[model samples]
Every structure is written in C-alpha cells, then in structure tokens.
Target: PEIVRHIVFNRYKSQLSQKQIDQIIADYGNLQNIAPEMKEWKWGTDLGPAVEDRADGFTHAYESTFHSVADFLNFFYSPPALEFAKEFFPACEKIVVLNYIINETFP
Candidate 1:
C-alpha cells in the first residue's frame, strides 16, 4: 500500500470569505479521475475568514500498491490516469506528486 499526503497553505493580499474558499474546495473535491487507492481527501479553514489567517489549506491523500517501482510508474503514466488528472485539476493553482517506500512489520 502507498500513502500520499500534503500540508497545504495559501495566501491572499486581502481578506476573503469562508464561502468563497469553500466553493473552490467544493469544485476541486469534485474533480474526476482520482486514484483507486485514494482513501480520503478533505479541507479545513482557519478560525478567521482570511487566507493568511487560515489554519490549514486543503489536504489530499492517496494510497497505492504495486509489484514494483516500474509497476507504479506504469500506472502513473497510463493514459486513463493522465486524462483524468488533466480534466479534474484544471482549476488548481498547483499540484505536486510524490512517492515513498515502506516495509510493513509485525511482532
């Protein structure tokens, strides 16, 4: 299994409303072609309604399992996944992809 996550933060010169931020998140959350292993993604706002004052930016997470790194690359580069990400994240200011390797253990 794979785990993907982010710590988000955004800034605006002037004050903004929670409603506007909420709307952006709502649209982004509804994007298409999400990874199969993606278990959860969500957003949270600051105690106040301004971007600089915001507590957390929107967060996204994904999990995946593959036979090897090559297998993972195959999935990442697949046409369907590419198409989906293109369609879904059109409005995003930025998107970053990352990877990690973990070994499970039991005692």
Candidate 2:
C-alpha cells in the first residue's frame, strides 16, 4: 500500500480580513473531517525565514494524507468536496494543487 499526499498553495484576495483568514483556515479542517478517507490534514500561512531566489507570494499552504490513490481520488471527486470549494473559492485570488507519494518519513 502507498500513501498519497495532497497539497494546495493559495494566494488570498487582498480585501480579506484576518478574521476571514482564520475562518478559511478553520474551514479546511472542517472539510478534512467531512471526508472519512482523509487520514491526516494540516494547513498554515507562508511566513518563514527568507530564502534567496525563491518565489514567496503564496499566502497559505494546505496538506492532506490519504491511505491510497483511490481514496484520494474519491475524496477529490466527491460532491461534498465540490460544495466545500464553492464555499471558499471567493476568498482566494489563486490556488495551485499538487499530489505525490511520500518517499520517506522519520519517527
């Protein structure tokens, strides 16, 4: 069995408030809970130590882990997931998603 990790990089609309941003982050957790197939999930803003020659416009990052590719696809194609996206789509100026298998992790 292989695990798949899904990630979203988002740039927020400048008009959104801190309170709205907080709500957006929280909503991500709520969406994770809605899908029982999601094994783990997390999200955070992009503030960090400056790295030279790297793009940094993304305002937030989100990640979710699934037991297998089928589980991930199921979640992605679910009606609930589509509804959830509709709820928050207005808050983000742009978003990019990615998925990949984790090669390794340490305890």
Candidate 3:
C-alpha cells in the first residue's frame, strides 16, 4: 500500500488582525467539508521554535492523508479550494507544502 500524506506549514502575516487570523484558522478547518477528498485532517499551532527545534519560523501545521498524490493535488486545485486560497493567502506571509509516501511506522 502506498499511502500519501499532505502537509502544510504557514507563517502568517504580522499585520493581520487577531480576528482575521482566527477566521483563517476556522477557514482551514472547513476544508474537509469543502474538499472531502482530503482525509484525516490534523493541525496545530507551533509550540515555539526553540522548544521544537528546527521548526524555523512556521507558526502552524496542517496535515491530511491521501490515497495518492493526484488525489491530494486535485483537492487543492478544486474550485472551492481555489476560492478558499484567495482569502487564506493574503493573511499568510509564507507557506510551505509537501507530499510524501508513508514509508514506515513503529509501535
């Protein structure tokens, strides 16, 4: 089985108001409903770079699992996702995204 994973790291713009940032987070949570193809949504705010180590400046992490990369790509490129991006991008100063195959698991 080749399970794929999608991950996003966000560095929000400092100028955005607290309310705007809150909405950004809420919008992100709605993606599962907006694009059902993306699965097992998981996200969290950074726990401080000094404590986490090598976290760089990314302030948030979003993750989802997919059966294939194509499924993940199509989800983000869908109309609803594109619309969401319009609002999501302006509040974000930077974003990093990655996809990979699940290679190992330990108990």
**lDDT for position 16 in model 1:** 43
lDDT for model 2, please.
Answer: 0.80
Instruction: Give each model's whole-structure lDDT.
Output: 0.46, 0.80, 0.82
Model 2 per-residue lDDT tens digits across residues 1-107: 57989888888899989898888778778886688887678887666545433435776788889998988888878987777788677788887888998878778
Candidate 1, superposed: residue stretches over 4 Å from native? 1-56, 104-107
- For every model in order, what is the number of clashing pairs? 0, 0, 0
Candidate 3 — which pairs collide? none
Ordering by TM-score: 3, 2, 1
List TM-score per model, in order.
0.40, 0.81, 0.82
Say which candidate scores most in TM-score.
3
Best by lDDT: 3
Q: What is the lDDT of residue 72 in candidate 2?
A: 81
- The residue-level lDDT of candidate 3 at 103 comes to 81
